[PDB]
Amino acid sequence: AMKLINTTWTHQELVNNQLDNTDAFLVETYSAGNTDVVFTQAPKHYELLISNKHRAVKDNELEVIREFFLKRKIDKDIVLMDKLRTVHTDKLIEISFPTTV
Ligand code: NA
Ligand code: NA
Numbered sequence: 001a002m003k004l005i006n007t008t009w010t011h012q013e014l015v016n017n018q019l020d021n022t023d024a025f026l027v028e029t030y031s032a033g034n035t036d037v038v039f040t041q042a043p044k045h046y047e048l049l050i051s052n053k054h055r056a057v058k059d060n061e062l063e064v065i066r067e068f069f070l071k072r073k074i075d076k077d078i079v080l081m082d083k084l085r086t087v088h089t090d091k092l093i094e095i096s097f098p099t100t101v
Pocket of ligand 1: 018019020021022023024025
């Protein structure tokens, strides 16, 4: 089955572009097979950007990716879990996780 692979080490342009020009203070990238994930933390919000150049991203994929970040990467204690926002477009899913701090 499909595992999330941290690919940050070979996305150093993108990591730095996002750190220097955005409110993000953490930027990481991951593969989920041929699906690409960008994960960030900034004051007041974490973000996941999930996209797939070839195909629509499937619902079970979304669920596996989301629950991986929630379990491993996101401090749920500061997240506003009733205020999650998920924007679904054609080949792009955007999940916002507001935070107290
Ligand atoms: Na920044
Ligand atoms: Na963020």
